[PDB]
Amino acid sequence: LQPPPQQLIVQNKTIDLPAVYQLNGGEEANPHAVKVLKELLGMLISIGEKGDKSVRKYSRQIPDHKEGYYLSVNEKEIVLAGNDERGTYYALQTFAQLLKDGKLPEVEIKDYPSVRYRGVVEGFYGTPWSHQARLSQLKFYGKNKMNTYIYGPKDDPYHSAPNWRLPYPDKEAAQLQELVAVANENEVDFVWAIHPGQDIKWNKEDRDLLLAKFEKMYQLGVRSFAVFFDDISGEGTNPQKQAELLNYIDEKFAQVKPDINQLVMCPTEYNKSWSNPNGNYLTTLGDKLNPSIQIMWTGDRVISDITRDGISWINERIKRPAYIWWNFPVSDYVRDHLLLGPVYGNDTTIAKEMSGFVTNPMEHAESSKIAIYSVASYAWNPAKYDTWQTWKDAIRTILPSAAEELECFAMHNSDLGPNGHGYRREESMDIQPAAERFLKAFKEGKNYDKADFETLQYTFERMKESADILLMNTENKPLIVEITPWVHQFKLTAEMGEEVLKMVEGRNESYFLRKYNHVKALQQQMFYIDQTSNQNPYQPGVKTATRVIKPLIDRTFATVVKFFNQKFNAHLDATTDYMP
Numbered sequence: 001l002q003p004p005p006q007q008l009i010v011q012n013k014t015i016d017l018p019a020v021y022q023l024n025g026g027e028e029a030n031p032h033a034v035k036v037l038k039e040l041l042g043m044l045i046s047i048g049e050k051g052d053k054s055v056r057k058y059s060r061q062i063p064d065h066k067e068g069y070y071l072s073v074n075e076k077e078i079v080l081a082g083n084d085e086r087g088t089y090y091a092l093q094t095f096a097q098l099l100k101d102g103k104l105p106e107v108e109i110k111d112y113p114s115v116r117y118r119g120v121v122e123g124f125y126g127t128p129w130s131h132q133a134r135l136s137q138l139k140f141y142g143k144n145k146m147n148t149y150i151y152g153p154k155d156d157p158y159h160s161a162p163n164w165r166l167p168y169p170d171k172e173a174a175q176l177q178e179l180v181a182v183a184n185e186n187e188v189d190f191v192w193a194i195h196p197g198q199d200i201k202w203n204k205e206d207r208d209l210l211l212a213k214f215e216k217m218y219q220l221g222v223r224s225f226a227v228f229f230d231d232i233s234g235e236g237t238n239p240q241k242q243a244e245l246l247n248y249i250d251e252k253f254a255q256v257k258p259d260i261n262q263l264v265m266c267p268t269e270y271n272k273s274w275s276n277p278n279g280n281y282l283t284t285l286g287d288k289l290n291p292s293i294q295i296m297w298t299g300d301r302v303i304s305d306i307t308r309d310g311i312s313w314i315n316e317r318i319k320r321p322a323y324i325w326w327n328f329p330v331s332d333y334v335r336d337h338l339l340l341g342p343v344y345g346n347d348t349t350i351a352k353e354m355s356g357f358v359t360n361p362m363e364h365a366e367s368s369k370i371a372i373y374s375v376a377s378y379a380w381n382p383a384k385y386d387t388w389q390t391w392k393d394a395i396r397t398i399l400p401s402a403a404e405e406l407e408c409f410a411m412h413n414s415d416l417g418p419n420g421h422g423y424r425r426e427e428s429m430d431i432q433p434a435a436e437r438f439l440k441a442f443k444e445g446k447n448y449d450k451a452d453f454e455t456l457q458y459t460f461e462r463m464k465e466s467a468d469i470l471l472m473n474t475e476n477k478p479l480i481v482e483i484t485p486w487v488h489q490f491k492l493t494a495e496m497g498e499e500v501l502k503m504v505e506g507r508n509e510s511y512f513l514r515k516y517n518h519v520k521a522l523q524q525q526m527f528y529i530d531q532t533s534n535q536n537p538y539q540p541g542v543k544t545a546t547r548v549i550k551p552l553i554d555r556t557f558a559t560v561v562k563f564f565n566q567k568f569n570a571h572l573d574a575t576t577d578y579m580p
């Protein structure tokens with residue numbers, strides 16, 4: 001079960017789905033919950049929210065938390081009872097995972113989230129997600145009990161400057177409506193952010209243009225709103241004025257409409273390291289900002305994990321629980337890397353200390369679903385959060401037809417490499433022991449272990465199988481299109497590894513020289529891809545398996561060439577990263 005329920009009691013009995021059933025509460029329960037139930041399928045099934053006639057028998061079982069639910073399956077009846085309408089929907093999300101093979105286990109579940117707001121902020125620089133991608137995301141949040149989507153792509157001119165003031169054109173507008181209607185159906189809060197800080201005038205006019213923009217987004221059906229003040233310059237940075245503006249928005253707008261849910265903001269100082277030692281900023285905000293208004297926070301740095309010391313430090317100042325904006329798996333400062341590793345580093349005991357937890361994803365929507373599924377799991381029930389297990393579960397969910405292959409590829413595409421934000425991740429941990437147990441031996445003339453060589457050749461053989469199976473998969477075509485330049489580079493990396501190992505078990509000079517020449521050419525092919533694919537202006541190219549595997553292959557090539565240049569006393573160039 002993903003996310004893991006707060007409480008679960010499992011009997012050993014399994015039951016069949018009923019061919020003949022009695023629906024009680026169909027006309028009372030959340031229609032988005034009842035339409036899933038009718039999708040999924042006499043015997044009583046009881047469905048509703050606390051207060052509904054149909055679940056009255058059970059109100060003591062339904063947890064007293066928003067988005068909570070009680071779910072029961074046994075011989076005689078099935079209970080799907082939420083504390084609120086969203087909790088009935090969530091009961092059904094859990095219910096659809098229990099049901100495998102037209103069969104259910106006998107179970108009892110009490111569930112609710114540990115964090116109030118959970119989801120995704122599309123808040124990266126680079127190509128905004130396509131519309132079909134966003135639709136896909138929204139159903140995905142639904143399924144994973146994520147209830148927040150903050151739409152705020154830095155590169156949308158109608159969200160950022162200069163045209164935050166201007167309403168969307170008709171087509172973009174109608175697409176934003178559809179999205180809103182899909183979010184609704186999937187129990188997600190579509191949160192429309194605006195980013196006006198860079199050119200805003202603290203006058204009546206601009207503050208009214210901002211309200212007139214919000215009003216227009218309201219007419220297309222938006223019910224939650226955010227105001228972003230990050231990465232801006234000038235008079236737009238004064239916290240008194242931000243507070244007075246957001247308070248104005250809260251009182252003249254959010255408090256005047258019948259149904260506005262979230263009102264969020266992003267401070268100009270949004271991580272410890274970016275907060276002015278000598279200044280007033282964050283405590284001014286915590287003092288002056290209406291208590292209902294959320295304040296976003298990235299950690300001790302732009303890129304960073306959320307610790308207990310870190311969350312306490314910000315909470316003391318903003319006088320409320322920080323709303324986490326977690327910059328992972330975002331890659332907009334390492335656009336030549338894919339970050340498909342597990343989600344970890346965040347303290348699991350601090351749920352009470354945060355209002356929300358959102359992930360800034362990659363411009364690759366589907367590749368992002370690995371972290372998004374994991375963040376969904378972490379924020380719902382952090383106490384039961386299992387990094388590695390959820391990661392594998394994410395992969396099995398995205399790509400069941402080739403899960404083993406995506407896991408292989410994803411294991412070796414996790415690290416960021418050195419970067420402007422100094423943030424790194426584990427990579428290729430499984431094969432690491434063998435890697436070093438080879439190269440430390442090899443370097444100083446010491447004979448390697450059979451089992452190390454074989455694990456490495458195994459590794460390389462498996463990378464190739466994985467890459468080729470992945471390129472040809474039609475179950476998740478959009479995922480495959482995103483990752484294809486890296487699947488190619490990943491394969492040349494494995495091929496180069498095999499050929500370098502053949503140089504080590506190197507039979508005879510001519511054979512040696514053949515492999516030598518094949519290596520130099522495989523490397524030229526990687527430069528070719530690195531210089532023709534993904535040619536963005538920031539970090540052009542395609543890097544893969546960079547933390548462990550490429551340096552193993554590189555360092556080993558230099559070494560065997562070196563040993564040949566002593567045995568036969570030769571000219572052979574010992575480098576690989578020569579440059580065009």
Ligand SMILES: CC(=O)N[C@H]1/C(=N/OC(=O)Nc2ccccc2)O[C@H](CO)[C@@H](O)[C@@H]1O
Pocket residue numbers: 123124125154230231266270298302325327330332333360
């Ligand atoms: C709240 C936040 O993270 N804001 C932006 C953000 N801003 O980062 C910086 O401004 N970094 C930076 C700027 C100048 C000098 C050093 C780092 O970082 C994220 C990941 O790069 C972006 O996706 C976000 O849009």
